[PDB]
Amino acid sequence: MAYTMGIDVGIASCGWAIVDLERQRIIDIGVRTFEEALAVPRREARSSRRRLRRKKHRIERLKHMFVRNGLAVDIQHLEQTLRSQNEIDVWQLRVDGLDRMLTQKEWLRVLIHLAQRRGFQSNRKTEDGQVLVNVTENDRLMEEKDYRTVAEMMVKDEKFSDHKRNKNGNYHGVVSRSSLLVEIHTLFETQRQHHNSLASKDFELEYVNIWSAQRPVATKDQIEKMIGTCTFLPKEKRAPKASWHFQYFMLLQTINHIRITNVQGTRSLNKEEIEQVVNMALTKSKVSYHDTRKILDLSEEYQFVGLDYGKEDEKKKVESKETIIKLDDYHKLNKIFNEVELAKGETWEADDYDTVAYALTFFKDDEDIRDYLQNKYKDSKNRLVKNLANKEYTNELIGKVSTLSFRKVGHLSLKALRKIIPFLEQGMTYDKACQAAGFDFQGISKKKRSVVLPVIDQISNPVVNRALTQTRKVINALIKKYGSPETIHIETGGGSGGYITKYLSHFISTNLEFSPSDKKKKVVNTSGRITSHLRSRWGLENDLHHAMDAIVIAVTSDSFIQQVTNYYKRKERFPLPWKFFREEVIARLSPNPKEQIEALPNHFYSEDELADLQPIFVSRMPKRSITGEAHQAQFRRVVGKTKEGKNITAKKTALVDISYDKNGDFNMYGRETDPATYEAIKERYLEFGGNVKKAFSTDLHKPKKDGTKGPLIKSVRIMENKTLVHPVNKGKGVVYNSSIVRTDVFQRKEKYYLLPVYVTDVTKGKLPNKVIVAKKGYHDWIEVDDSFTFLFSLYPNDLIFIRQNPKKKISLKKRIESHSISDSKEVQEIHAYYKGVDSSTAAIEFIIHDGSYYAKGVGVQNLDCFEKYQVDILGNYFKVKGEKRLELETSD
RNA sequence: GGAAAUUAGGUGCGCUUGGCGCUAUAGUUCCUUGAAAAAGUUGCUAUAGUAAGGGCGACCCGAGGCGUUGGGGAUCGCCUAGCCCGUUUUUACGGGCUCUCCCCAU
DNA sequence: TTTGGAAAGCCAAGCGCACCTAATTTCC
């Protein structure tokens, strides 16, 4: 009952092997699969929703004020007022308001318009992009041409003669926030000179306060919550790198670890030399190894350990190149401290440097910085948090230090650094200073080992988190079947930049109980190179190769690697784990394992071992979450219905993105109402070689009736057909579908029917109730009634079994096409992982267990059998006998 | 393999802003089709919508991940969960306890 | 029905933290 576990872990799969190294037999093998980054669309959607909401609120706050300050009676009045007929362009009104009184209506439009877009405001703390160049250029245009305001620039300047708003993803019209504030103030001023009653200084101040309001990049404890904890004191936060304690610790560690070598040997610096290097670092901006040699007058027989001196030993060049210490944060803060006069007694102390470091590292807005440095910061639970100096600093200082930017933390808390530094000051190495302070420098886990792996610390990297948690489920399933392993051999694929390898090794080593044995490393990391050589040499050379690799990994120890090097040394003047190992591996990876094992000489497996023997069945992780993108993003117009009941949609499309045929024709909506534009585009496309980028890299004009040049043509509406759309914005647009949540399967008079359920259906009161009819519009799909029996719901990667009726077979297609005369396999029946449904055809798509074959467009209506199964972690599956059609109810 | 530091990078997660794109409507503009009624096209500007939908004014949630169980999953719960006890490994170690629902298994 | 495949919202300008790599050092 002792075994070796082999594990092959990627970001999308865990191959595994149970091997008995004494019996010299493969016990059991398998594969668990779990197929931008995952959170990015969600994060971006979050940002978009907030931006739009905050803009709307700003306009709403302004409209509420306009009532209260007496520009209108109420909001109902205000809306009607402004939704009267606009005569003059609001940009022209913005310019007119500089030299004449604006009417109430004109003024209201101007104030709303100014609040739509607030311009660029840098948050930079440390090449210039297209936004910065345009902001700078626009600022220069206004300064040099004497434009009184942004609007005056935008109306009068040649740069904006064709458009004011930005087009085709350029940033020509982006201006500074400050220039728009100048405009607001100017217009309130000029309106007051021209006797506008609604331009009072009170109104001005409330307008600017509303217009200017914005949230800081971080508020309160937000940064503190992201900062990690001390390696030694895990309820402490990590210290800022800008703190004195961090910088002095780092300095002392560095100097104490210097080593110098001559022909005789290697030595450290003495206490006298250290003091000299330490004092130089505290006064000089940067220190090189050259400055270290110079301050100590160190003989040219000595070299510093760790430098590359090459052949020539051009010592000044090598040593001058290498900066050993640069206490930037210290010197920057020390300069600001020296601008601030102190009383005769007191001096700037370590706690002042730490306090300012904390303030600027843990907080980014001026309100939090100010409160903290005034010693009255309240955290997000209203609890006072005094600064480290317990000091209310002066407004002068707070103002001055807020010009600095600090960031980043070390691994250790301030408390830990306070205890360690005194021992580093006595010249100890880092490790011994830690010991002297009362800390185990390795922070070794004191925790008790466990029979199954405990839950994993949830980490923010969703791909790494999935891999580790799936690998845990595999290991724990295998422990619960076979008991504890003697060792675990692990290989990883490089897909997480080393995070999975480092995490997983340490986690298993620290937490898992191994079966009692003499073997030293409980966790053995094998190289892909060695694995790859053995597979080639053994001629063992899809999802099954992960299982193969898990076998090789399991039987790869260091003692076996020696036998390969012994062989290659001997051959210079091939090792197998056991007899028939190749043939056994091939047997265990095959569909007919029993037949292949029994074909080996001399009852290679016992009668028991053969009775237990199943073919490998790859286990695929279920995906049964009902959240997801609700529908596609772009809004479309419905312009008609096809004969077969599809929606005809249209959407404005840039000339470069239009789809043209051989003749340069395209599906332009309203072609009949614009032959000049239709013909101009087609003609332009044909002039060039159907090179769309070349053709549409210059302006195209619509010809006027007289034949001279009229307006530019940048896009037209293109028509396309779609069965299923959803209305948005009170039916003012439609949108297409995104991923299907689940497919509900029904039976009626021995035929099968499919009802796709979309994310938009989760908001409804009732489930959708129409099963697909191929090539017909939604109106002609069939309403479900008592004649249909509900069978089950299929999510992606649910397991199905189908049997085709006798008149035909299912054509499985090889995922990887080959030199074979046959790249398809036709089967009467199949167990397969469901992928989805084609709503135009009621035909499905699936993959066989290991992903090596698939089918697509398989109609279900006249199958002989259609059943649902479910798979466990290790590959066993179980028939679903009965399901209820579940309602769908998000908490949102 | 493990701790800390440095230099140069990488991946991910979170946040604040800016500007578009698309849709709808109004004006203006290029007009086109149509006997007419009408319908619609090009450019510019404005105003509105921009997950679907839900909860209470620098309002909030809403496309991600994980937990579970006899074995699995979630629309449930959580996102660095909660709540106790033991212990001088008291910033640690140990041991208790725990929502609703669906499928499978005995 | 099966097969082949087009389309899908996007970029600029920053503020942060976590984890990981390569090289270098002192250490268990």
Next chain:
DNA sequence: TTTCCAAA
């Protein structure tokens, strides 16, 4: 990657 269209 996924929906689902039009071609085969």
